[PDB]
Amino acid sequence: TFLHAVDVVLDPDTAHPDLFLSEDRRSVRRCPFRHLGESVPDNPERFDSQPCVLGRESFASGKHYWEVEVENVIEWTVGVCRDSVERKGEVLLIPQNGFWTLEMHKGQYRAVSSPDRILPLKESLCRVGVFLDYEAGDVSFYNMRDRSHIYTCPRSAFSVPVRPFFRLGCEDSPIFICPALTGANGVTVPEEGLTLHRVSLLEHHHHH
Amino acid sequence: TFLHAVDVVLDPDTAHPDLFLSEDRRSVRRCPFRHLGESVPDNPERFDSQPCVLGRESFASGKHYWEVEVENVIEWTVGVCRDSVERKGEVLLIPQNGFWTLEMHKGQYRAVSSPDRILPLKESLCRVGVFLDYEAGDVSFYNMRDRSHIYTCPRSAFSVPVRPFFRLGCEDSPIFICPALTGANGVTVPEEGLTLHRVSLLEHHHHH
Ligand SMILES: [Zn+2]
Ligand SMILES: [Zn+2]
Numbered sequence: 001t002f003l004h005a006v007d008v009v010l011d012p013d014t015a016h017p018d019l020f021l022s023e024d025r026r027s028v029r030r031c032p033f034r035h036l037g038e039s040v041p042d043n044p045e046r047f048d049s050q051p052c053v054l055g056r057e058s059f060a061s062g063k064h065y066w067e068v069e070v071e072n073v074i075e076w077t078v079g080v081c082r083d084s085v086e087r088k089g090e091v092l093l094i095p096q097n098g099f100w101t102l103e104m105h106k107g108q109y110r111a112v113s114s115p116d117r118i119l120p121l122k123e124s125l126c127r128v129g130v131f132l133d134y135e136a137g138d139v140s141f142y143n144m145r146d147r148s149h150i151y152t153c154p155r156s157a158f159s160v161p162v163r164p165f166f167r168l169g170c171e172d173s174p175i176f177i178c179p180a181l182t183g184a185n186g187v188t189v190p191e192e193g194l195t196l197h198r199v200s201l202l203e204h205h206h207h208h
Numbered sequence: 209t210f211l212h213a214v215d216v217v218l219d220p221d222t223a224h225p226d227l228f229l230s231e232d233r234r235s236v237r238r239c240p241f242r243h244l245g246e247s248v249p250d251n252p253e254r255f256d257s258q259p260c261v262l263g264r265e266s267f268a269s270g271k272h273y274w275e276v277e278v279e280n281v282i283e284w285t286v287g288v289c290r291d292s293v294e295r296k297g298e299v300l301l302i303p304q305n306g307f308w309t310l311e312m313h314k315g316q317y318r319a320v321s322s323p324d325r326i327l328p329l330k331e332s333l334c335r336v337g338v339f340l341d342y343e344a345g346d347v348s349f350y351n352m353r354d355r356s357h358i359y360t361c362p363r364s365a366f367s368v369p370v371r372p373f374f375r376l377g378c379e380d381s382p383i384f385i386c387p388a389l390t391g392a393n394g395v396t397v398p399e400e401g402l403t404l405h406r407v408s409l410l411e412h413h414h415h416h
Binding site for chain 2: 002003004005007063065067111112117119120129131132133136138139140142145147148149150151152153154155178180181182183184185187189190191192193194195196197198
């Protein structure tokens with residue numbers, strides 16, 4: 001019955017080597033330059049060619065959703081994939097291969113990353129909802145400005161656990177995976193209440 | 209751990225008699241005129257003076273949130289209350305009486321319905337999130353345009369179950385309680401997917 005508002009954190013062991021994750025692993029950009037790191041170049045979990053990264057959490061049942069900020073990113077993909085998807089080479093990001101996606105490519109939105117399913121959106125998307133109903137075989141996408149439906153993929157027998165999926169098709173342009181709401185978690189609330197609480201990859205550059 | 213994105217439906221047995229609920233009990237307005245109905249004028253669950261209505265579901269544990277559309281409503285209150293709150297006469301809608309609220313009154317937003325806690329918001333709110341962390345004693349409010357925090361009430365020992373709470377301080381102006389996202393639930397998904405799916409109290413009037 002209950003819809004889970006997921007708290008998505010990225011899995012750095014899946015991330016293509018050109019992706020730079022925030023310290024909190026909740027935002028990611030593709031950087032043109034290398035950061036000297038501790039990370040294995042080509043462990044089997046890692047996407048080696050497609051500039052992709054997965055959420056750490058997998059879902060095997062139930063209803064789940066999360067939201068992604070994509071303003072100022074010209075090329076991106078969001079959605080869900082099987083935990084078993086192929087990671088190596090020029091993987092086709094299509095349902096038949098275990099990927100259920102929404103893409104921005106060359107100023108258009110494409111259902112299931114298909115040049116034959118251009119979605120006739122009438123505004124630039126800024127915050128996209130990704131929705132999963134596992135048993136119903138449903139991956140759906142929402143415009144979170146007005147909570148309006150964008151697309152539901154053809155219904156699928158997922159069979160294995162699925163994970164949040166992300167692709168960055170352009171450089172120097174971060175996406176932000178919106179944390180689940182937490183209220184005042186961890187924060188002292190004064191006797192009159194806590195007002196307008198505020199707690200970035202936007203400042204990451206290579207011109208130091 | 210998990211945040212519940214609640215699907216809130218109103219309880220008509222709590223609603224002040226001047227409130228008119230949509231057929232699906234997910235939106236409400238205060239109407240100046242009577243609708244000939246089947247409803248008891250003054251059952252003990254019903255607010256008799258404060259123009260208020262509760263959600264049907266109560267929460268005794270965990271983290272929960274829901275969202276409310278309030279555009280074009282000049283006077284409204286949203287929040288959480290104890291299931292045990294007083295229903296009769298001119299109840300003071302304050303924490304000490306079991307009400308944790310955010311109010312729009314006379315062009316200002318007021319924390320806990322207090323004329324002494326005017327919130328310095330810099331935009332007109334359109335969609336408000338109401339958040340509960342029961343064990344942490346937390347009722348929080350969010351601006352869902354950008355998922356920004358507005359206010360957390362002083363932390364409270366709720367003790368008994370709590371319910372969604374709504375007040376309509378003006379006439380002919382509906383609030384819409386946003387349904388939990390459902391993807392394509394109940395809807396046939398064509399072989400190419402389902403595109404831009406669309407499924408009102410805005411048309412309710414007394415000039416027939
Ligand atoms: Zn960099
Ligand atoms: Zn009416």
